Structures are given as C-alpha cells and as structure tokens.
Design an enzyme around this catalytic site. Structure first.
Site, PDB file in Angstrom:
ATOM      1  CG  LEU A  44      -1.963  -1.123   1.230  1.00  0.00           C
ATOM      2  CD1 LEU A  44      -2.855  -1.032   2.458  1.00  0.00           C
ATOM      3  CD2 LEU A  44      -2.806  -1.102  -0.036  1.00  0.00           C
ATOM      4  N   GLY A  45       0.601   2.155  -0.932  1.00  0.00           N
ATOM      5  CA  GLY A  45       1.370   3.386  -1.053  1.00  0.00           C
ATOM      6  C   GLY A  45       1.215   4.259   0.174  1.00  0.00           C
ATOM      7  NE  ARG A  46       0.122   4.870   5.466  1.00  0.00           N
ATOM      8  CZ  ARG A  46      -0.271   6.019   5.991  1.00  0.00           C
ATOM      9  NH1 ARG A  46      -1.214   6.731   5.391  1.00  0.00           N
ATOM     10  NH2 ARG A  46       0.288   6.460   7.110  1.00  0.00           N
ATOM     11  CB  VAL A  52       1.309  -0.156   5.088  1.00  0.00           C
ATOM     12  CG1 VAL A  52      -0.106  -0.658   5.328  1.00  0.00           C
ATOM     13  CG2 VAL A  52       1.781   0.683   6.267  1.00  0.00           C
ATOM     14  CG  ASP A 155       2.901  11.613  12.885  1.00  0.00           C
ATOM     15  OD1 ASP A 155       3.094  12.750  12.401  1.00  0.00           O
ATOM     16  OD2 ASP A 155       3.209  10.570  12.276  1.00  0.00           O
TER      17      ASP A 155
HETATM   18 BR1  LIG Z   1      -3.447   1.482   6.152  1.00  0.00          BR
HETATM   19  C1  LIG Z   1      -2.638   1.568   7.856  1.00  0.00           C
HETATM   20  C2  LIG Z   1      -1.414   2.233   8.028  1.00  0.00           C
HETATM   21  C3  LIG Z   1      -0.837   2.298   9.269  1.00  0.00           C
HETATM   22  N1  LIG Z   1       0.287   2.862   9.699  1.00  0.00           N
HETATM   23  N2  LIG Z   1       0.392   2.636  10.998  1.00  0.00           N
HETATM   24  N3  LIG Z   1      -0.651   1.943  11.403  1.00  0.00           N
HETATM   25  C4  LIG Z   1      -1.435   1.721  10.353  1.00  0.00           C
HETATM   26  C5  LIG Z   1      -2.620   1.059  10.221  1.00  0.00           C
HETATM   27  C6  LIG Z   1      -3.234   0.973   8.974  1.00  0.00           C
HETATM   28 BR2  LIG Z   1      -4.854   0.057   8.820  1.00  0.00          BR
END
Ligand SMILES: Brc1cc2nn[nH]c2cc1Br
EC number: 2.7.11.1
Length: 333
Positions: A44-46, A52, A155
C-alpha cells in the site's frame, strides 16, 4: 531558573490511577504470532520508508492490513503495541488484530483490521462544508478517547486519517509516535511532521501534553477550510515558527516565551521579526468562501494558540457551535 512546569488541563493523572502495567510498556510481554498466517497481496502506497501491505488471513479468508515494522528500538515497538492494545475498540481508533514475526527474518509486524487505502489527504481538499465538520467531529472522538485513556498521538495529520467516504467511516492510524502522558514528564520534541508541529516543539518546550494534538487538528482544519496545503508552510523547523508568527503575530509568541521562561534558540532572534496577528478574512477568497463561516473561524482560532494550555480540549471542541448540526443529525441518525 529553567523553564516553568506545565500540567495538562484534563485527564492529568489518569495513568497514575491505573495499574503500573497499563503504561509501563517496557515490561509488557508480547506473544508474537506467525506471519505465515497471512499472505501479502500488495504494498500500500504509504510513502517511501513505509512498509504497509494489504494481506489475507489464510485461517478465515478475511482481508487485513500488515505493517512491517522497520528496525527500530524494541522500546518503541512495545510502546506502539501497548497503546494500540489499550485503545482497542475506542471510537474511530484503528483495531490491532494480531502481532506477528516473519519466521525467517524475525522482523516484527502489526496486523490491523481492513480499511480502504484512502487517507484524508486525498479527499480533504474536495469536501463540502458539512463533511469537514462531520469528519472533524469524528477525528475529535478518537482524540478525546485516546486523551481520556492517557495517550497523546503526536502525529495527527491528514495522511494518518483513513476515511471510507462511501460508508462515512474514519480511523485514526499510525500510533508509532504516540506516548503516555505523565504529569511532569519532559518529552522529545522531534515528533510530528513539520507542518503540524506545535509551537512547543519548535521552541523546544518539553513538558507538553494532549494539547499538542489539538494544534495539529487546527492545522488540518485551517488547510481544509482555506483550501491551503499546508497552512503553515515552513522550509525547515526554524522557518516553520516564522510562518506561524506571520499569522498568529509575534506579541503572543513572546508572551508565551516569557510565561514559561523558555530559552529561545538564538538562531530565532534574527528571523521571527515583528508581525501583527492577522485576521482570518485575509485567507478567504471566492474559491473557499463556501467552506468558511464565523463558526469555523471562532473554532479554528481557539485551536491555534501558542499557549498549549489555552487551546480547546477535544471535549471542549466537540461542544463548539461549529458542530451543532452534526451533533443534532447524529442524535436522530
Ligand atoms: Br493502512 C494503515 C497504516 C498504518 N500505519 N500505521 N498503522 C497503520 C494502520 C493501517 Br490500517
């Protein structure tokens, strides 16, 4: 004399009245599961560093989200696990479903309830007046809950709010920077992303509290109603305070410095200058006037204060006129 101590206006001693086990996260023993219970579908693009993943629980075929914890102090991992476990089932808090290790690499990972991979940043510059108030109200539930549970998020930003717009469903995510509030504890100021950093972080005042998250909430609100991303657009952490100073003015800044006896980094002395406190009408124009009302401005003004103690608490925010129709509609529906 050093800096003057500060205490939180609300939820001040809640961790003290809890068992030691609630907040002494370093003594928590994690029963690590097996990550082979989950098969990763896709990344997932995070962001860049982030790892993720959308994944599937083999045992029951449910979709989950897996966050591979990039190597960091075991301290920090236990902290995030404990906070998530403590806040499980709270309003609009992401649910931690399992804690696992990859059998080969031994790398730690957290397994979450499934959400759509649509964060608030993708949607928050295209919302109606009503929807901004609705989602602000929903974020406020998560914050009042976590604050009432002795936890500050630290955050809060649009990237860390997952919204399912189709079901009007919201989850505050990424608790890796969250920490337990203890009256008198001096905290690390290297938290939050630049644009959402509270003045306390910028001037290096360490004895901060839940009100930090309310500053960040204000930055999001300002950005949404004025259609301005980010609202405080600093080049770096020093310039970030200059951008705040140019809107909030320098007089309340220096009054805040003096109130808490803050030793201002001498680097600031040339750059802050002298600025009036600007009226919000300055940021209004034809493109955004439909999002901006007296209620929005009164609300926003009471979030964005230098003095952390003078910012609305999450519960106070929820009782503001800005949410009256949201509250009314929530009661009936
Ligand atoms: Br998508 C997602 C990204 C996250 N970063 N930190 N906790 C997370 C939970 C989810 Br669901």
């Amino acid at each position: 004399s050093g800096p003057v101590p500060s205490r939180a206006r609300v939820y001040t001693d809640v961790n003290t009245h809890r068992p030691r086990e609630y907040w002494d996260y370093e003594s928590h023993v994690v029963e690590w599961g097996n990550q082979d219970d989950y098969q990763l579908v896709r990344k997932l693009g995070r962001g860049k560093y982030s790892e993720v993943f959308e994944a599937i629980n083999i045992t029951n075929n449910e979709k989950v989200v897996v966050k591979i914890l990039k190597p960091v102090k075991k301290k920090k991992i236990k902290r995030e696990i404990k906070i998530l476990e403590n806040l499980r089932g709270g309003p609009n808090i992401i649910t931690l479903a399992d804690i696992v290790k990859d059998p080969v690499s031994r790398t730690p990972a957290l397994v979450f309830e499934h959400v759509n991979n649509t964060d608030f940043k993708q949607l928050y510059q295209t919302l109606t007046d009503y929807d901004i108030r609705f989602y602000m109200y929903e974020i406020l539930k998560a914050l009042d809950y976590c604050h009432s549970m002795g936890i500050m998020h630290r955050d809060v930003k649009p990237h860390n709010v997952m919204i399912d717009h189709e079901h009007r469903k919201l989850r505050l995510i990424d608790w890796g920077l969250a920490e337990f509030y203890h009256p008198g504890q001096e905290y690390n100021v290297r938290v939050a992303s630049r644009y959402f950093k509270g003045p306390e972080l910028l001037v290096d005042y360490q004895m901060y509290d839940y009100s930090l998250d309310m500053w960040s909430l204000g930055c999001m609100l300002a950005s949404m109603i004025f259609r301005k991303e980010p609202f405080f657009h600093g080049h770096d952490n020093y310039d970030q305070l200059v951008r705040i100073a140019k809107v909030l003015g320098t007089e309340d800044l220096y009054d805040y410095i003096d109130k808490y006896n803050i030793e201002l980094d001498p680097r600031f002395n040339d750059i802050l200058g002298r600025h009036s406190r600007k009226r919000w009408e300055r940021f209004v124009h034809s493109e955004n006037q439909h999002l901006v009302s007296p209620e929005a401005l009164d609300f926003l003004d009471k979030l964005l204060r230098y003095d952390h103690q003078s910012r609305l608490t999450a519960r106070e925010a929820m009782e503001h006129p800005y949410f009256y129709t949201v509250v009314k509609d929530q009661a009936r529906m």
